[PDB]
Amino acid sequence: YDRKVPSPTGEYVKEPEWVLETDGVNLSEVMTVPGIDPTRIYTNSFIDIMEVLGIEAGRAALYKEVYNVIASDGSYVNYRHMALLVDVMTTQGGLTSVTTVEILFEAGASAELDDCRGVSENVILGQMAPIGTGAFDVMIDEESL
Amino acid sequence: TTKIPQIGDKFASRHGQKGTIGITYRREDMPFTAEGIVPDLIINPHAIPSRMTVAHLIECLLSKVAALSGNEGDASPFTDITVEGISKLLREHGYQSRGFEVMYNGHTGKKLMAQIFFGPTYYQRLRHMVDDKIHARARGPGLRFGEMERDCMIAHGAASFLKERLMEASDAFRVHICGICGLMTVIA
Amino acid sequence: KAIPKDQRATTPYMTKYERARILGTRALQISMNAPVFVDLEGETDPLRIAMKELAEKKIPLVIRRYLPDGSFEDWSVEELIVD
Amino acid sequence: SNTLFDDIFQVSEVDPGRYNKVCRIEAASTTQDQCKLTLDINVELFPVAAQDSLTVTIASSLTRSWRPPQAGDRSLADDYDYVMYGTAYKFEEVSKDLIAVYYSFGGLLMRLEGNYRNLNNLKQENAYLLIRR
Amino acid sequence: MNAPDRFELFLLGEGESKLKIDPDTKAPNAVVITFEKEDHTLGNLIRAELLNDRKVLFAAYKVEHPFFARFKLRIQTTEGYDPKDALKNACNSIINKLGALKTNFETEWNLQTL
Amino acid sequence: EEGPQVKIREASKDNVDFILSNVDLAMANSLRRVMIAEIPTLAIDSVEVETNTTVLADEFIAHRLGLIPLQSMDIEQLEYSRDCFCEDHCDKCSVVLTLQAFGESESTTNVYSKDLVIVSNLMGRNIGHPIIQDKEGNGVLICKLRKGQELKLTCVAKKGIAKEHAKWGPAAAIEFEYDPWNKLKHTDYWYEQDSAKEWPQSKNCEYEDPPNEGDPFDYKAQADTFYMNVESVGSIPVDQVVVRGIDTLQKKVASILLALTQM
Amino acid sequence: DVDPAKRIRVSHHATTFTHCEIHPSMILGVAASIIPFPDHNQSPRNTYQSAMGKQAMGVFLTNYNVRMDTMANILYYPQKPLGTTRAMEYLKFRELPAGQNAIVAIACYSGYNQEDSMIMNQSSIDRGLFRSLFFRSYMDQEKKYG
Amino acid sequence: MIVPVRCFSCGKVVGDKWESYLNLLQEDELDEGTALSRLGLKRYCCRRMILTHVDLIEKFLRYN
Amino acid sequence: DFSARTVISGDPNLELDQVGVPKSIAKTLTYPEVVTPYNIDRLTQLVRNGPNEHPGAKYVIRDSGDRIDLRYSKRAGDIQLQYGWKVERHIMDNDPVLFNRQPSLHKMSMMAHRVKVIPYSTFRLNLSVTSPYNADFDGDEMNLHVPQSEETRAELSQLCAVPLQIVSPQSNKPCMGIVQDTLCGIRKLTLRDTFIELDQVLNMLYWVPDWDGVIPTPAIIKPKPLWSGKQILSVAIPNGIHLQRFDEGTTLLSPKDNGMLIIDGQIIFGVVEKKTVGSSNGGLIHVVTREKGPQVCAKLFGNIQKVVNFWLLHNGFSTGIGDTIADGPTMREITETIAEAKKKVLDVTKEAQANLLTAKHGMTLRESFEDNVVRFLNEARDKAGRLAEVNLKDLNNVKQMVMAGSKGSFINIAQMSACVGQQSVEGKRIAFGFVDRTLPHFSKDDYSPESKGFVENSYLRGLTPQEFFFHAMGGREGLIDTAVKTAETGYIQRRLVKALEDIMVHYDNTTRNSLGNVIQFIYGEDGMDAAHIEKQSLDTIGGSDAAFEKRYRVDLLNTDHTLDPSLLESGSEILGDLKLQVLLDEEYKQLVKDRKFLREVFVDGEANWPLPVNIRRIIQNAQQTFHIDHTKPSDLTIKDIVLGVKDLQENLLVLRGKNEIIQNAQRDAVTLFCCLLRSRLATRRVLQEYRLTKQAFDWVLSNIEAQFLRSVVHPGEMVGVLAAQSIGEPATQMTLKKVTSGVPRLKEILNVAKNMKTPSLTVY
Amino acid sequence: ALATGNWGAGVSQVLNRYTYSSTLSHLRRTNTPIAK
Ligand SMILES: [Mn+2]
Ligand SMILES: [Mn+2]
Ligand SMILES: [Zn+2]
Ligand SMILES: [Zn+2]
């Protein structure tokens, strides 16, 4: 592979490096093998990244897996979509996937507190949902001339 | 009932591309050939190169010669028929041989800078038409607003519409409520 | 549980959302023959009229912004910057 | 109210590349080792051949509609064959310690390398250009 | 159906007129006339004669949607010279040249066997 | 007789090829247009059916009816039905035709337009008659019947313009050309190797002098001379499609002056 | 010395044939046997035509007027195709066709044939082009198990 | 179902030319194009008309 | 409920934001409008005309909640309406209504349009809204929805209207551009040689509805007055709009007419094609949106299409079987190109047949052989097709479309004119479905091109039987794969949207779930709205160390390295000033840091990265707006610049909290924008490159500041859905290496799967 | 079982009569219920 790297006089150049690529994955162990750079090792298994290097690093992998897919088809989506997703998938600290009366009974017994900010719940209740134009209240300005 | 073609109806050649009629023009307004021949249909060139439907194009050359010559034109697959041949034949018969012709704009009569591929092609009227397909239900006494449509409007942020739209007509009953026990237990 | 007019920390500009709801609220009222505050230099259309109102800053309403913890800040239309 | 460059040129070359009605003269000046012209010409309305030569003046009148010939029947601030009307977009290539000014006629382009008329070529559009054979 | 009957292409609805004439704000000595139940036949014809007239500064026409038969012609003329006058002066020419031509025709046709 | 000049070159009952010469394209084209679209003509445009045990349907029949061309030389003398103060139709706005046919023969019985009878007073204005142009004097084949089948109808013709429906149009194709050399460079010819080997020469080139390879392009020329050919279908004779067509524009134009006068 | 415009075919490197095809066009079925030049078309398209054909209007039997079915479409004026295949023979398509040969122009003219749409000639329509008959039959039963 | 009355595209009447067309080919032994040109159908639009008609009525007439 | 659905058609004569509604539909759908003294006379007239004449009405409702039915109602003709009654009127021109093409996979599949009532029966649309809706005119139908109160009408127009959705957040560029014809033709119209005469000119000009009446002055006066195409399109592009672009060796004399250069609303140089006018990051529609606002932008699409399409309607364009024929000579070259490849194959054949070929490393021998013969064959296909491309002429219409960008590509030339190429099924050459052979017409053990699915012929030429069948094999595999994509993609998309649906931005700028949890402590790490973000080059990043010190270093104590005094009035007086030099060194230290920082952030060296506030373009405009002479020293001082840009930073606010924590956030959020900033308004630059005056400069800054503020995201916005739609919608046009890719992969990611299909370690 | 398609079911259907060749096509169909 080609690697752009800065040069002695400051500009970026190409500098090839050999790389190895595997079928199959043993990151904990391969990382340790003498002669490789352990700081740059990669895998497309973002689970193993998280297991070895932690939730952050897996979040960064996962992003990079999703971005791969989306640029492999040749299209482009703003950072501000895929990061959100990826945060959603990693804010409990692990990688969480994103993929009636009966239920009410359980609420009951659980004492579920419904925050009321969804749009269905609000429908039910005859209300706007606190989204968008519903996220603030409007009142009459008794303080004006 | 008789159905006369109209804006809306669908048509196809036999090369796996359809279209609806987008407007009609009477013949004065169409573009025309020195001979005075005018098209019965006008299709857009942007429909061609991606679909790589060169058989359309070849059928229309082949069909010109047929009609000029009164022979059936043999369009079966796997023969010796070739465009070069066909274009030969059509030059013998006095037209440019890849099927272009000069034509003249209708509205003004001036010639067209560009010439135009012009020929018969067999087109089919397909079933199923703007009249059967239009409906329009808004009461007195697809076509829906489903999960995904909701989602686009939450996207845009449109809460009031989302409440209007998804309500009941089911009247707003009013109710007293304890503010310690939230229940509707209250004696009013 | 309210936040004092100094020390407010949320934007001073009007949001698209606020604006859309203001215009719409006011147009509803204008639509129902509610008095108007601004010169109708001809206008007959409620939204339009509303927008004239908002441009002349004569919409006496206030926007209450909740924060995610229950707390809120009150910003008046008069004051919100409109871009 | 004026004129502001004007000279005579020697045509090195004429490329039509790829277009049919338009071609690009490379012309030299007869005079100055220095001042050149590269320039786009409608060769249908004004043909042009290698080594022919040219009396070229930019100039700056004789922004209101346009009105037909009529003014045009005596009033010709032109005793030329060929006149365009353009706009300068300049880059003052301020190159070496000679100038280039750039000019676009509906997209037919020009460019003058030189010097002596720094304090001469409008910063500005209103720029006409005129040719006799 | 939803189709407007075909007579609408040549025949005026209640309250419509053949012309409406209105002054153009953008420029002086200009007007825009909209011609109803008319199309290119006329509309290119009047226009192009307006442009043989040297006191014509501008003339143009267009049919804004094909669905309706109407066109709009815009004339601009020199100070002193009413536009509408330029359109009589022009419709007049037309009449005259055709005058002529039905004659030159009718003639060429007896000089004729078969 | 100074102005737009004419020059027929061929003429025949059915076509008239000529050259207009000293006019603008606009009027040339316009005249083409009118000829195609607005010369009034007569045509069946209502049809009541008493009986039809035919193998075709009524509307299918009717529509064929409105296509058969009918005589139209005296059609300025028939008022448009909607201008006539009659309730519905009459003799001043309408020729009425009938058709009855029964398949008497074992063999198959054709129905032609010659089988059409006019049934109303024409005031000896030559209109209404089925136009016939075949050797056998049949005119158009309208239907066919089997032994035992019957069709009876009446029709009403009425004056109308092809704008309104092409049945009413008197012209058929109208050849039109100009500049056959291409001198005006109004068109830009497509080719693979050579534009002049590749495109056919127009008959109209003979009448005009080729250009000479040196000849530098002529900016000022315009379009002055046009090669036409109007073909008539028959309800109006040809010379007439022209004359009436020049005439109809000149009418249009004048209604414009008439309504500047009314402002 | 082969015809430069013919396609390339790669000969018999074969002394052992035991049979020969009757004709290669016979790999096709009934639908694709009506496409002209399918051998000059990308493959999926001939797969769409093979459906659409199934929706075109023609004359489904000479006996329509006597049957009584739920729906039916007949075209006023079927024409046979100027360009046919040899298999149509057997399929009768020229007898009972489902299409008309239209004059067609491939052109940008006015912007109303964009995105897989078409301008059609009104006058052409007046005079018949693509008109068809449409018949629906309603049924109903009497009383029953009361 | 029956010759159409005119060329869809140009208006030429054409529905007075079917008996003859067919007489011109079975009687007088001409090839379909020579026959069409005989009837004065010289644009490819009209030629298409008669050359691709199919007279279905002739079957429909067989039923009782 | 209060909706309609029909077939859609295009219409070049409606605006971008209208939709045409047939009359009949318009008479069916209604809006309830309250009587007031503003409208009682109109409502009266509409009541009179009734239910069946459009503009009319269907019911009247009075005080009482009684409903008066206009069609039946013996008093239908004698209603005297009162203030505060309701009329349910038909909809009418310019009411807002929402239009949607299903499946509605992002929000621009539901936009708000201004009605236009029309005859016949289809809803009509401008061609340039097609693409967001992903609709065409062969059948598609769309649904139209009438809002029922004032508030909802407001919502629709003030947030969902089409014009407000030209630039979208999905990819921080336009999502609507000029297409199909008008793109064919705007290129044509803008070529060097296209000139137009007066007659046409003025008709073009009158066609743009808000032409000032001025006939422009023609670019040829001399033998003849002839205007260029460029000039007359220019009529449509409004004043004040600058755009430049360099293509592969454009220069300001573009020999080729490449690239684009446009200054105060007039085209200087370049042909106009899909780069300029398409839906492109930093093209004209993205420029005009921003510089002039959504409504002017949306007129532009229709002025441009009016103009161009008129031109095109009289110029003409078509395509034919001719445009696929390449030269005899080309064809023999093609045939040889082909022939060669077939000999390469043959040797690799014999070579393997003698056991001499090597594999390399866990790759099998046969795998090695295939991988080569398929290289060979493809390589052939491609040469042959570049062969054909070259050979066609600029008047070749296929070429002409490819060129403008409006339809087609290389592959299509190729296969139509030169060679269709190797077919495959599962990644592989056609396989031996009978025993040891692909069809019974071949003999056993044949691995050659023909026997395993290379189609050598083009479509023009024709496929043989065998080829025909293997291309059908191929084809079918896509038909299937297509369906399975469509399927998969569908369920992903709904799952993403359910997952994210509740995240929203809150007025602390945090993004959160319906619990209040924190997902992001500021949206997008920067607090921006993605609509307001554009690709810009960060300058400090690239370049040699020498070069970055030429461009940014000022040393006033050194005669070679100060600021020439022509740059600047003060320039004599500052030489050797020590105390200016202290600032300036401070400024450079910060530039130097900046470049390190950034090269840590972008380890690669990539300089172009989307950030809010296109400063080049502000500066460009400053340069035009103040008529700036590049031949005068400026009146700026050092301190003006230097302290001026320092000060601006303080004001690019995203967060507003008095404590330190929020202030640190604030700072970190605006770090990258501020690198761009200092680089771009450093002292030598502002003098030596940009030559600003004081005033212009002071204008550049305050603008930067307004624009920056206006790019902050607004509280209330529902990401989450947005994010999900944005990720999903383009995963649906994945209709299409030796790692699992594209849709299945992406299933594999969201599903968090234990057992992935190709797992791999890349080891450096 | 002929009225229903009750067997395997879709086994009997009403014969298409849109167009002639659609009929022939229908009589020459095949179907496969349920690895490639
Ligand atoms: Mn399509
Ligand atoms: Mn579609
Ligand atoms: Zn009467
Ligand atoms: Zn014809």
JSON list of N, CA, C and O in Angstrom, two decimals, chain I residues 724-747:
[
{"chain": "I", "resi": 724, "resn": "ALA", "atom": "N", "xyz": [-31.17, 8.93, 10.65]},
{"chain": "I", "resi": 724, "resn": "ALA", "atom": "CA", "xyz": [-31.44, 7.60, 10.16]},
{"chain": "I", "resi": 724, "resn": "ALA", "atom": "C", "xyz": [-31.83, 7.44, 8.64]},
{"chain": "I", "resi": 724, "resn": "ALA", "atom": "O", "xyz": [-31.50, 6.35, 8.07]},
{"chain": "I", "resi": 725, "resn": "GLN", "atom": "N", "xyz": [-32.52, 8.49, 8.10]},
{"chain": "I", "resi": 725, "resn": "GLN", "atom": "CA", "xyz": [-32.97, 8.63, 6.85]},
{"chain": "I", "resi": 725, "resn": "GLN", "atom": "C", "xyz": [-31.78, 8.91, 6.08]},
{"chain": "I", "resi": 725, "resn": "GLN", "atom": "O", "xyz": [-31.70, 8.52, 5.03]},
{"chain": "I", "resi": 726, "resn": "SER", "atom": "N", "xyz": [-30.94, 9.78, 6.46]},
{"chain": "I", "resi": 726, "resn": "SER", "atom": "CA", "xyz": [-29.78, 9.96, 5.80]},
{"chain": "I", "resi": 726, "resn": "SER", "atom": "C", "xyz": [-28.87, 8.81, 5.67]},
{"chain": "I", "resi": 726, "resn": "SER", "atom": "O", "xyz": [-28.01, 8.80, 4.84]},
{"chain": "I", "resi": 727, "resn": "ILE", "atom": "N", "xyz": [-28.88, 7.91, 6.52]},
{"chain": "I", "resi": 727, "resn": "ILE", "atom": "CA", "xyz": [-28.03, 6.74, 6.36]},
{"chain": "I", "resi": 727, "resn": "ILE", "atom": "C", "xyz": [-28.90, 5.77, 5.49]},
{"chain": "I", "resi": 727, "resn": "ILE", "atom": "O", "xyz": [-28.49, 5.07, 4.72]},
{"chain": "I", "resi": 728, "resn": "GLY", "atom": "N", "xyz": [-30.14, 5.68, 5.73]},
{"chain": "I", "resi": 728, "resn": "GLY", "atom": "CA", "xyz": [-30.90, 4.71, 4.98]},
{"chain": "I", "resi": 728, "resn": "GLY", "atom": "C", "xyz": [-31.18, 4.90, 3.51]},
{"chain": "I", "resi": 728, "resn": "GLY", "atom": "O", "xyz": [-31.08, 4.04, 2.67]},
{"chain": "I", "resi": 729, "resn": "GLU", "atom": "N", "xyz": [-31.83, 6.05, 3.23]},
{"chain": "I", "resi": 729, "resn": "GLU", "atom": "CA", "xyz": [-32.05, 6.52, 1.83]},
{"chain": "I", "resi": 729, "resn": "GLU", "atom": "C", "xyz": [-30.93, 6.24, 0.95]},
{"chain": "I", "resi": 729, "resn": "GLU", "atom": "O", "xyz": [-31.12, 5.74, 0.04]},
{"chain": "I", "resi": 730, "resn": "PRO", "atom": "N", "xyz": [-29.70, 6.59, 1.16]},
{"chain": "I", "resi": 730, "resn": "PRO", "atom": "CA", "xyz": [-28.67, 6.10, 0.18]},
{"chain": "I", "resi": 730, "resn": "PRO", "atom": "C", "xyz": [-28.27, 4.70, 0.33]},
{"chain": "I", "resi": 730, "resn": "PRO", "atom": "O", "xyz": [-27.87, 4.30, -0.60]},
{"chain": "I", "resi": 731, "resn": "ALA", "atom": "N", "xyz": [-28.45, 4.01, 1.37]},
{"chain": "I", "resi": 731, "resn": "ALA", "atom": "CA", "xyz": [-28.38, 2.56, 1.27]},
{"chain": "I", "resi": 731, "resn": "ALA", "atom": "C", "xyz": [-29.42, 1.83, 0.41]},
{"chain": "I", "resi": 731, "resn": "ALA", "atom": "O", "xyz": [-29.15, 0.84, 0.01]},
{"chain": "I", "resi": 732, "resn": "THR", "atom": "N", "xyz": [-30.60, 2.25, 0.24]},
{"chain": "I", "resi": 732, "resn": "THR", "atom": "CA", "xyz": [-31.44, 1.95, -0.86]},
{"chain": "I", "resi": 732, "resn": "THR", "atom": "C", "xyz": [-30.81, 2.23, -2.23]},
{"chain": "I", "resi": 732, "resn": "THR", "atom": "O", "xyz": [-31.26, 1.70, -3.02]},
{"chain": "I", "resi": 733, "resn": "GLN", "atom": "N", "xyz": [-29.89, 3.07, -2.65]},
{"chain": "I", "resi": 733, "resn": "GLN", "atom": "CA", "xyz": [-29.44, 3.01, -4.08]},
{"chain": "I", "resi": 733, "resn": "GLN", "atom": "C", "xyz": [-28.05, 2.38, -4.15]},
{"chain": "I", "resi": 733, "resn": "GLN", "atom": "O", "xyz": [-27.01, 2.88, -4.71]},
{"chain": "I", "resi": 734, "resn": "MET", "atom": "N", "xyz": [-28.02, 1.27, -3.49]},
{"chain": "I", "resi": 734, "resn": "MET", "atom": "CA", "xyz": [-26.93, 0.41, -3.49]},
{"chain": "I", "resi": 734, "resn": "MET", "atom": "C", "xyz": [-27.35, -0.75, -4.42]},
{"chain": "I", "resi": 734, "resn": "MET", "atom": "O", "xyz": [-26.89, -1.92, -4.25]},
{"chain": "I", "resi": 735, "resn": "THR", "atom": "N", "xyz": [-28.28, -0.52, -5.37]},
{"chain": "I", "resi": 735, "resn": "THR", "atom": "CA", "xyz": [-28.70, -1.50, -6.57]},
{"chain": "I", "resi": 735, "resn": "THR", "atom": "C", "xyz": [-27.43, -2.23, -7.51]},
{"chain": "I", "resi": 735, "resn": "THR", "atom": "O", "xyz": [-27.33, -1.92, -8.80]},
{"chain": "I", "resi": 736, "resn": "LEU", "atom": "N", "xyz": [-26.53, -3.11, -6.85]},
{"chain": "I", "resi": 736, "resn": "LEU", "atom": "CA", "xyz": [-25.10, -3.52, -7.28]},
{"chain": "I", "resi": 736, "resn": "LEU", "atom": "C", "xyz": [-24.47, -4.85, -6.64]},
{"chain": "I", "resi": 736, "resn": "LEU", "atom": "O", "xyz": [-23.46, -5.46, -7.07]},
{"chain": "I", "resi": 737, "resn": "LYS", "atom": "N", "xyz": [-14.47, -5.20, -2.63]},
{"chain": "I", "resi": 737, "resn": "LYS", "atom": "CA", "xyz": [-14.94, -6.34, -3.53]},
{"chain": "I", "resi": 737, "resn": "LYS", "atom": "C", "xyz": [-15.03, -7.74, -2.67]},
{"chain": "I", "resi": 737, "resn": "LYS", "atom": "O", "xyz": [-16.28, -8.09, -2.23]},
{"chain": "I", "resi": 738, "resn": "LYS", "atom": "N", "xyz": [-13.80, -8.41, -2.36]},
{"chain": "I", "resi": 738, "resn": "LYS", "atom": "CA", "xyz": [-13.69, -9.88, -1.85]},
{"chain": "I", "resi": 738, "resn": "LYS", "atom": "C", "xyz": [-13.72, -10.03, -0.24]},
{"chain": "I", "resi": 738, "resn": "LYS", "atom": "O", "xyz": [-13.76, -11.24, 0.28]},
{"chain": "I", "resi": 739, "resn": "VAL", "atom": "N", "xyz": [-13.81, -8.81, 0.39]},
{"chain": "I", "resi": 739, "resn": "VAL", "atom": "CA", "xyz": [-14.65, -8.53, 1.60]},
{"chain": "I", "resi": 739, "resn": "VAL", "atom": "C", "xyz": [-16.26, -8.30, 1.44]},
{"chain": "I", "resi": 739, "resn": "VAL", "atom": "O", "xyz": [-16.76, -7.74, 0.45]},
{"chain": "I", "resi": 740, "resn": "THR", "atom": "N", "xyz": [-17.06, -8.76, 2.41]},
{"chain": "I", "resi": 740, "resn": "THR", "atom": "CA", "xyz": [-18.51, -8.55, 2.29]},
{"chain": "I", "resi": 740, "resn": "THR", "atom": "C", "xyz": [-18.70, -7.17, 2.26]},
{"chain": "I", "resi": 740, "resn": "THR", "atom": "O", "xyz": [-18.10, -6.44, 3.05]},
{"chain": "I", "resi": 741, "resn": "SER", "atom": "N", "xyz": [-19.60, -6.79, 1.43]},
{"chain": "I", "resi": 741, "resn": "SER", "atom": "CA", "xyz": [-19.71, -5.36, 1.14]},
{"chain": "I", "resi": 741, "resn": "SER", "atom": "C", "xyz": [-21.13, -4.96, 1.13]},
{"chain": "I", "resi": 741, "resn": "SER", "atom": "O", "xyz": [-22.04, -5.81, 1.24]},
{"chain": "I", "resi": 742, "resn": "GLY", "atom": "N", "xyz": [-21.32, -3.64, 1.01]},
{"chain": "I", "resi": 742, "resn": "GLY", "atom": "CA", "xyz": [-22.62, -3.04, 0.74]},
{"chain": "I", "resi": 742, "resn": "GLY", "atom": "C", "xyz": [-23.68, -3.58, 1.55]},
{"chain": "I", "resi": 742, "resn": "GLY", "atom": "O", "xyz": [-23.37, -3.65, 2.58]},
{"chain": "I", "resi": 743, "resn": "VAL", "atom": "N", "xyz": [-24.82, -4.11, 1.12]},
{"chain": "I", "resi": 743, "resn": "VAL", "atom": "CA", "xyz": [-25.94, -4.25, 2.01]},
{"chain": "I", "resi": 743, "resn": "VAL", "atom": "C", "xyz": [-25.79, -5.32, 3.03]},
{"chain": "I", "resi": 743, "resn": "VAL", "atom": "O", "xyz": [-26.03, -5.11, 4.19]},
{"chain": "I", "resi": 744, "resn": "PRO", "atom": "N", "xyz": [-25.30, -6.39, 2.72]},
{"chain": "I", "resi": 744, "resn": "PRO", "atom": "CA", "xyz": [-25.13, -7.38, 3.73]},
{"chain": "I", "resi": 744, "resn": "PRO", "atom": "C", "xyz": [-24.23, -7.07, 4.70]},
{"chain": "I", "resi": 744, "resn": "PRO", "atom": "O", "xyz": [-24.27, -7.64, 5.76]},
{"chain": "I", "resi": 745, "resn": "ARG", "atom": "N", "xyz": [-23.26, -6.32, 4.36]},
{"chain": "I", "resi": 745, "resn": "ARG", "atom": "CA", "xyz": [-22.36, -5.84, 5.34]},
{"chain": "I", "resi": 745, "resn": "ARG", "atom": "C", "xyz": [-22.98, -5.02, 6.21]},
{"chain": "I", "resi": 745, "resn": "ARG", "atom": "O", "xyz": [-22.73, -5.18, 7.45]},
{"chain": "I", "resi": 746, "resn": "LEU", "atom": "N", "xyz": [-23.73, -4.15, 5.70]},
{"chain": "I", "resi": 746, "resn": "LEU", "atom": "CA", "xyz": [-24.29, -3.22, 6.54]},
{"chain": "I", "resi": 746, "resn": "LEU", "atom": "C", "xyz": [-25.28, -3.85, 7.44]},
{"chain": "I", "resi": 746, "resn": "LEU", "atom": "O", "xyz": [-25.30, -3.57, 8.64]},
{"chain": "I", "resi": 747, "resn": "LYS", "atom": "N", "xyz": [-26.02, -4.83, 7.02]},
{"chain": "I", "resi": 747, "resn": "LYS", "atom": "CA", "xyz": [-26.76, -5.63, 7.99]},
{"chain": "I", "resi": 747, "resn": "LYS", "atom": "C", "xyz": [-25.88, -6.23, 9.16]},
{"chain": "I", "resi": 747, "resn": "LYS", "atom": "O", "xyz": [-26.31, -6.49, 10.31]}
]
